[PDB]
């Protein structure tokens, strides 16, 4: 299964995933591809922000679906 | 000047002309990556 993640630079990232893959895992894949720490990552699909524990199938994300990545500082 | 949302996909911040339409936070990340 392939999904796409669009970055702030409009760059499209292609990830090999499973429907069972959690959002946390997708963020780890993004870190491998881009070097971006997961805590700074916010994933958006269909205008909704994605929770780490949930899966791609939970958010009805399908083959060649496109996700949006927003980067945010963590002040704590 | 009229307010404009940042040019980054799915970001709801306001962008500025100094950052080429990006918000300050995203412009900073763009430098990082
Ligand atoms: K935007
Ligand atoms: Zn922004």
Short mmCIF file of N, CA and C and ligand atoms in Angstrom, two decimals:
data_model
loop_
_atom_site.label_atom_id
_atom_site.label_comp_id
_atom_site.label_asym_id
_atom_site.label_seq_id
_atom_site.Cartn_x
_atom_site.Cartn_y
_atom_site.Cartn_z
N UNK A 1 0.83 -1.20 0.00
CA UNK A 1 0.00 0.00 0.00
C UNK A 1 0.86 1.26 0.00
N UNK A 2 0.56 2.17 -0.91
CA UNK A 2 1.28 3.44 -1.01
C UNK A 2 0.39 4.60 -0.60
N UNK A 3 0.93 5.51 0.21
CA UNK A 3 0.25 6.76 0.51
C UNK A 3 1.20 7.92 0.27
N UNK A 4 0.65 9.12 0.15
CA UNK A 4 1.47 10.30 -0.12
C UNK A 4 1.33 11.34 0.99
N UNK A 5 2.46 11.94 1.36
CA UNK A 5 2.47 13.00 2.36
C UNK A 5 3.03 14.28 1.76
N UNK A 6 2.21 15.32 1.72
CA UNK A 6 2.61 16.59 1.14
C UNK A 6 3.18 17.51 2.23
N UNK A 7 4.36 18.06 1.98
CA UNK A 7 5.03 18.90 2.97
C UNK A 7 4.75 20.39 2.77
N UNK A 8 5.30 21.21 3.65
CA UNK A 8 5.12 22.66 3.57
C UNK A 8 5.77 23.26 2.33
N UNK A 9 6.78 22.57 1.80
CA UNK A 9 7.43 22.99 0.56
C UNK A 9 6.71 22.42 -0.65
N UNK A 10 5.55 21.82 -0.43
CA UNK A 10 4.80 21.20 -1.50
C UNK A 10 5.43 19.92 -2.01
N UNK A 11 6.49 19.47 -1.35
CA UNK A 11 7.14 18.22 -1.70
C UNK A 11 6.25 17.04 -1.32
N UNK A 12 6.12 16.08 -2.22
CA UNK A 12 5.29 14.91 -1.96
C UNK A 12 6.14 13.70 -1.56
N UNK A 13 5.88 13.18 -0.36
CA UNK A 13 6.61 12.03 0.15
C UNK A 13 5.81 10.75 -0.08
N UNK A 14 6.46 9.74 -0.67
CA UNK A 14 5.82 8.45 -0.88
C UNK A 14 6.24 7.46 0.20
N UNK A 15 5.25 6.90 0.90
CA UNK A 15 5.52 5.94 1.96
C UNK A 15 4.91 4.58 1.66
N UNK A 16 5.64 3.52 1.98
CA UNK A 16 5.11 2.17 1.91
C UNK A 16 4.52 1.83 3.27
N UNK A 17 3.21 1.62 3.32
CA UNK A 17 2.52 1.42 4.59
C UNK A 17 1.53 0.25 4.55
N UNK A 18 0.98 -0.08 5.71
CA UNK A 18 -0.12 -1.03 5.81
C UNK A 18 -1.34 -0.30 6.36
N UNK A 19 -2.54 -0.78 6.04
CA UNK A 19 -3.76 -0.19 6.61
C UNK A 19 -3.74 -0.25 8.13
N UNK A 20 -3.02 -1.22 8.67
CA UNK A 20 -2.90 -1.42 10.10
C UNK A 20 -1.91 -0.45 10.76
N UNK A 21 -1.06 0.18 9.94
CA UNK A 21 -0.06 1.12 10.44
C UNK A 21 -0.67 2.28 11.22
N UNK A 22 -0.14 2.53 12.41
CA UNK A 22 -0.60 3.64 13.23
C UNK A 22 0.02 4.94 12.74
N UNK A 23 -0.52 6.07 13.20
CA UNK A 23 -0.01 7.38 12.80
C UNK A 23 1.39 7.60 13.35
N UNK A 24 1.64 7.09 14.55
CA UNK A 24 2.97 7.15 15.16
C UNK A 24 4.02 6.52 14.25
N UNK A 25 3.69 5.37 13.67
CA UNK A 25 4.59 4.69 12.75
C UNK A 25 4.84 5.49 11.48
N UNK A 26 3.78 6.09 10.95
CA UNK A 26 3.89 6.92 9.75
C UNK A 26 4.82 8.10 10.01
N UNK A 27 4.74 8.66 11.21
CA UNK A 27 5.62 9.76 11.60
C UNK A 27 7.08 9.31 11.72
N UNK A 28 7.28 8.07 12.16
CA UNK A 28 8.62 7.49 12.24
C UNK A 28 9.18 7.28 10.83
N UNK A 29 8.32 6.89 9.91
CA UNK A 29 8.71 6.72 8.51
C UNK A 29 9.10 8.07 7.91
N UNK A 30 8.37 9.11 8.29
CA UNK A 30 8.66 10.47 7.85
C UNK A 30 10.02 10.92 8.39
N UNK A 31 10.29 10.60 9.65
CA UNK A 31 11.58 10.91 10.25
C UNK A 31 12.73 10.23 9.50
N UNK A 32 12.53 8.99 9.09
CA UNK A 32 13.55 8.27 8.32
C UNK A 32 13.78 8.94 6.97
N UNK A 33 12.70 9.36 6.33
CA UNK A 33 12.77 9.97 5.01
C UNK A 33 13.30 11.40 5.03
N UNK A 34 12.93 12.17 6.05
CA UNK A 34 13.17 13.61 6.05
C UNK A 34 14.06 14.11 7.18
N UNK A 35 14.16 13.34 8.25
CA UNK A 35 14.95 13.74 9.40
C UNK A 35 14.17 14.59 10.38
N UNK A 36 12.86 14.68 10.16
CA UNK A 36 11.99 15.47 11.02
C UNK A 36 11.51 14.68 12.23
N UNK A 37 11.87 15.15 13.44
CA UNK A 37 11.42 14.52 14.69
C UNK A 37 9.90 14.46 14.75
N UNK A 38 9.35 13.31 15.17
CA UNK A 38 7.90 13.05 15.20
C UNK A 38 7.10 14.04 16.04
N UNK A 39 7.69 14.55 17.12
CA UNK A 39 6.98 15.46 18.01
C UNK A 39 6.64 16.79 17.32
N UNK A 40 7.43 17.13 16.31
CA UNK A 40 7.21 18.35 15.54
C UNK A 40 6.24 18.12 14.40
N UNK A 41 5.83 16.87 14.22
CA UNK A 41 4.95 16.50 13.11
C UNK A 41 3.47 16.55 13.47
N UNK A 42 2.69 17.17 12.60
CA UNK A 42 1.24 17.13 12.69
C UNK A 42 0.70 16.61 11.37
N UNK A 43 -0.06 15.53 11.41
CA UNK A 43 -0.60 14.95 10.18
C UNK A 43 -2.08 15.28 9.99
N UNK A 44 -2.42 15.74 8.79
CA UNK A 44 -3.78 16.12 8.47
C UNK A 44 -4.33 15.30 7.31
N UNK A 45 -5.50 14.70 7.50
CA UNK A 45 -6.21 14.05 6.41
C UNK A 45 -7.66 14.50 6.42
N UNK A 46 -8.16 14.91 5.25
CA UNK A 46 -9.52 15.43 5.11
C UNK A 46 -9.83 16.55 6.11
N UNK A 47 -8.82 17.37 6.40
CA UNK A 47 -9.00 18.51 7.27
C UNK A 47 -8.98 18.19 8.76
N UNK A 48 -8.82 16.92 9.10
CA UNK A 48 -8.76 16.53 10.51
C UNK A 48 -7.35 16.13 10.92
N UNK A 49 -6.97 16.48 12.15
CA UNK A 49 -5.66 16.13 12.68
C UNK A 49 -5.67 14.67 13.15
N UNK A 50 -4.59 13.95 12.87
CA UNK A 50 -4.54 12.52 13.13
C UNK A 50 -3.87 12.19 14.46
N UNK A 51 -4.54 11.38 15.27
CA UNK A 51 -4.01 10.95 16.56
C UNK A 51 -3.04 9.79 16.38
N UNK A 52 -1.96 9.79 17.15
CA UNK A 52 -0.88 8.82 16.99
C UNK A 52 -1.31 7.36 17.13
N UNK A 53 -2.20 7.08 18.08
CA UNK A 53 -2.60 5.72 18.38
C UNK A 53 -3.50 5.09 17.34
N UNK A 54 -4.22 5.92 16.60
CA UNK A 54 -5.16 5.44 15.60
C UNK A 54 -4.44 4.94 14.36
N UNK A 55 -5.15 4.22 13.50
CA UNK A 55 -4.56 3.64 12.30
C UNK A 55 -5.01 4.37 11.05
N UNK A 56 -4.33 4.08 9.94
CA UNK A 56 -4.70 4.65 8.64
C UNK A 56 -6.11 4.22 8.24
N UNK A 57 -6.46 2.99 8.58
CA UNK A 57 -7.78 2.45 8.27
C UNK A 57 -8.87 3.13 9.08
N UNK A 58 -8.53 3.57 10.29
CA UNK A 58 -9.46 4.29 11.15
C UNK A 58 -9.92 5.59 10.50
N UNK A 59 -8.99 6.27 9.82
CA UNK A 59 -9.28 7.54 9.19
C UNK A 59 -9.68 7.37 7.73
N UNK A 60 -9.99 6.14 7.34
CA UNK A 60 -10.43 5.81 5.99
C UNK A 60 -9.42 6.23 4.92
N UNK A 61 -8.14 6.14 5.26
CA UNK A 61 -7.06 6.46 4.33
C UNK A 61 -6.79 5.27 3.41
N UNK A 62 -6.88 5.51 2.11
CA UNK A 62 -6.82 4.42 1.14
C UNK A 62 -5.54 4.42 0.31
N UNK A 63 -5.47 3.50 -0.65
CA UNK A 63 -4.33 3.40 -1.55
C UNK A 63 -4.17 4.67 -2.37
N UNK A 64 -2.96 5.23 -2.34
CA UNK A 64 -2.64 6.49 -3.01
C UNK A 64 -3.46 7.68 -2.50
N UNK A 65 -3.88 7.62 -1.24
CA UNK A 65 -4.49 8.77 -0.59
C UNK A 65 -3.38 9.75 -0.22
N UNK A 66 -3.73 11.03 -0.13
CA UNK A 66 -2.74 12.05 0.17
C UNK A 66 -2.98 12.70 1.53
N UNK A 67 -1.92 12.77 2.34
CA UNK A 67 -1.99 13.37 3.66
C UNK A 67 -1.20 14.68 3.67
N UNK A 68 -1.54 15.57 4.60
CA UNK A 68 -0.83 16.84 4.72
C UNK A 68 -0.02 16.90 6.01
N UNK A 69 1.23 17.34 5.89
CA UNK A 69 2.13 17.42 7.04
C UNK A 69 2.38 18.87 7.45
N UNK A 70 2.07 19.18 8.71
CA UNK A 70 2.32 20.50 9.26
C UNK A 70 3.34 20.39 10.38
N UNK A 71 4.35 21.26 10.36
CA UNK A 71 5.40 21.23 11.37
C UNK A 71 5.18 22.28 12.45
N UNK A 72 5.35 21.87 13.71
CA UNK A 72 5.11 22.75 14.85
C UNK A 72 6.14 22.54 15.95
N UNK A 73 6.64 23.64 16.51
CA UNK A 73 7.58 23.58 17.62
C UNK A 73 6.86 23.08 18.88
N UNK A 74 7.59 22.38 19.74
CA UNK A 74 7.04 21.92 21.01
C UNK A 74 7.69 22.66 22.17
N UNK A 75 6.98 23.67 22.68
CA UNK A 75 7.50 24.47 23.77
C UNK A 75 7.41 23.77 25.12
N UNK A 76 6.33 23.01 25.30
CA UNK A 76 6.11 22.31 26.55
C UNK A 76 5.83 23.25 27.71
N UNK B 1 -2.52 46.06 4.45
CA UNK B 1 -2.56 44.84 3.65
C UNK B 1 -3.53 43.81 4.22
N UNK B 2 -4.35 43.19 3.36
CA UNK B 2 -5.31 42.16 3.77
C UNK B 2 -4.62 40.93 4.34
N UNK B 3 -5.23 40.31 5.34
CA UNK B 3 -4.65 39.13 5.98
C UNK B 3 -4.71 37.92 5.05
N UNK B 4 -3.63 37.14 5.04
CA UNK B 4 -3.56 35.94 4.22
C UNK B 4 -3.08 34.74 5.03
N UNK B 5 -3.74 33.60 4.85
CA UNK B 5 -3.32 32.37 5.50
C UNK B 5 -1.96 31.96 4.95
N UNK B 6 -1.19 31.23 5.75
CA UNK B 6 0.12 30.77 5.32
C UNK B 6 0.02 29.89 4.07
N UNK B 7 1.08 29.90 3.27
CA UNK B 7 1.08 29.16 2.01
C UNK B 7 1.28 27.66 2.20
N UNK B 8 1.74 27.26 3.38
CA UNK B 8 1.95 25.84 3.68
C UNK B 8 0.62 25.09 3.73
N UNK B 9 0.58 23.89 3.13
CA UNK B 9 -0.64 23.07 3.12
C UNK B 9 -1.11 22.75 4.53
N UNK B 10 -2.41 22.95 4.77
CA UNK B 10 -3.06 22.62 6.04
C UNK B 10 -2.66 23.49 7.25
N UNK B 11 -1.79 24.47 7.04
CA UNK B 11 -1.47 25.40 8.12
C UNK B 11 -2.46 26.57 8.17
N UNK B 12 -2.95 26.86 9.37
CA UNK B 12 -3.97 27.88 9.57
C UNK B 12 -3.42 29.19 10.11
N UNK B 13 -2.10 29.30 10.19
CA UNK B 13 -1.47 30.55 10.62
C UNK B 13 -1.62 31.61 9.54
N UNK B 14 -1.33 32.86 9.90
CA UNK B 14 -1.27 33.93 8.91
C UNK B 14 0.15 34.05 8.40
N UNK B 15 0.31 34.11 7.08
CA UNK B 15 1.62 34.28 6.49
C UNK B 15 1.98 35.75 6.39
N UNK B 16 3.25 36.03 6.16
CA UNK B 16 3.69 37.41 5.97
C UNK B 16 4.62 37.55 4.76
N UNK B 17 4.71 38.77 4.23
CA UNK B 17 5.46 39.02 3.00
C UNK B 17 6.96 38.82 3.17
N UNK B 18 7.46 39.04 4.38
CA UNK B 18 8.88 38.87 4.67
C UNK B 18 9.27 37.41 4.53
N UNK B 19 8.35 36.53 4.92
CA UNK B 19 8.58 35.09 4.85
C UNK B 19 8.01 34.48 3.58
N UNK B 20 7.85 35.31 2.55
CA UNK B 20 7.36 34.86 1.24
C UNK B 20 6.00 34.17 1.28
N UNK B 21 5.13 34.63 2.17
CA UNK B 21 3.79 34.08 2.27
C UNK B 21 3.67 33.03 3.36
N UNK B 22 4.80 32.54 3.85
CA UNK B 22 4.81 31.59 4.95
C UNK B 22 4.58 32.32 6.27
N UNK B 23 4.10 31.60 7.27
CA UNK B 23 4.09 32.12 8.63
C UNK B 23 5.52 32.01 9.15
N UNK B 24 5.80 32.68 10.27
CA UNK B 24 7.15 32.67 10.83
C UNK B 24 7.63 31.28 11.24
N UNK B 25 6.72 30.48 11.79
CA UNK B 25 7.08 29.15 12.28
C UNK B 25 7.44 28.22 11.13
N UNK B 26 6.62 28.21 10.09
CA UNK B 26 6.86 27.37 8.92
C UNK B 26 8.07 27.83 8.12
N UNK B 27 8.30 29.14 8.08
CA UNK B 27 9.47 29.67 7.39
C UNK B 27 10.74 29.19 8.08
N UNK B 28 10.69 29.12 9.40
CA UNK B 28 11.81 28.63 10.20
C UNK B 28 12.09 27.15 9.92
N UNK B 29 11.02 26.36 9.86
CA UNK B 29 11.15 24.93 9.56
C UNK B 29 11.66 24.72 8.14
N UNK B 30 11.23 25.58 7.22
CA UNK B 30 11.67 25.51 5.84
C UNK B 30 13.19 25.69 5.73
N UNK B 31 13.74 26.53 6.60
CA UNK B 31 15.19 26.70 6.66
C UNK B 31 15.83 25.42 7.18
N UNK B 32 15.22 24.84 8.22
CA UNK B 32 15.72 23.59 8.79
C UNK B 32 15.64 22.46 7.78
N UNK B 33 14.55 22.42 7.03
CA UNK B 33 14.32 21.35 6.06
C UNK B 33 13.89 21.92 4.71
K1 LIG C 1 -2.59 27.14 4.20
ZN1 LIG C 2 2.49 28.19 8.32
#
